[PDB]
Amino acid sequence: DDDDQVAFSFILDNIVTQKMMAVPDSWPFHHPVNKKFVPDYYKVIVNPMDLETIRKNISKHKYQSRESFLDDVNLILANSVKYNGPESQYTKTAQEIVNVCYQTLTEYDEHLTQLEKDICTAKEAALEEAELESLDPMT
Numbered sequence: 001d002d003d004d005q006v007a008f009s010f011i012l013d014n015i016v017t018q019k020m021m022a023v024p025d026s027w028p029f030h031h032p033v034n035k036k037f038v039p040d041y042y043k044v045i046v047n048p049m050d051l052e053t054i055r056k057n058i059s060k061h062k063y064q065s066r067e068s069f070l071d072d073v074n075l076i077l078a079n080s081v082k083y084n085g086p087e088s089q090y091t092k093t094a095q096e097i098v099n100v101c102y103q104t105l106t107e108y109d110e111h112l113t114q115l116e117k118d119i120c121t122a123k124e125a126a127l128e129e130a131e132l133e134s135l136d137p138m139t
């Protein structure tokens, strides 16, 4: 909710919508799998992920780092490797989603490096204030 977290999330959301979702034939990854359409999916995938869920997470500011966002991006790929196989066209398409994620992030490397540091400085200051305000039981 701070300016820096809002700017960080703004970059992640644009990478998802403008770049990752534009990969050709990426539609299997745009939304959660519906068991009515893929009956055995959740018998095999125990940690499902998709781009819409990532966008809901970005909206809630779940990610304060590239690494945490990229953990969920990578889950999409890993799940396709498990469910479809490493050589499936599903998995080739997932791989391209991940590649264009990494490539687009690199175009923002300096600014995202700074934003991650500034988010973490502000979180730490706010944590230390909240700890001190509780510890004195006066107010």
Ligand SMILES: CN(C)C(=O)c1cccc(-c2cn(C)c(=O)c3[nH]ccc23)c1
Binding pocket: 027, 028, 029, 031, 032, 033, 034, 035, 037, 038, 079, 080, 083, 084, 090
């Ligand atoms: C809401 N929609 C569009 C679906 O539930 C839907 C429909 C048709 C296919 C898929 C599908 C998705 N993903 C991620 C796969 O790895 C996969 N492997 C075989 C089919 C699929 C999902």
Ligand SMILES: [Ca+2]
Binding pocket: 132, 133, 134, 135, 136, 137, 138, 139
């Ligand atoms: Ca107090």
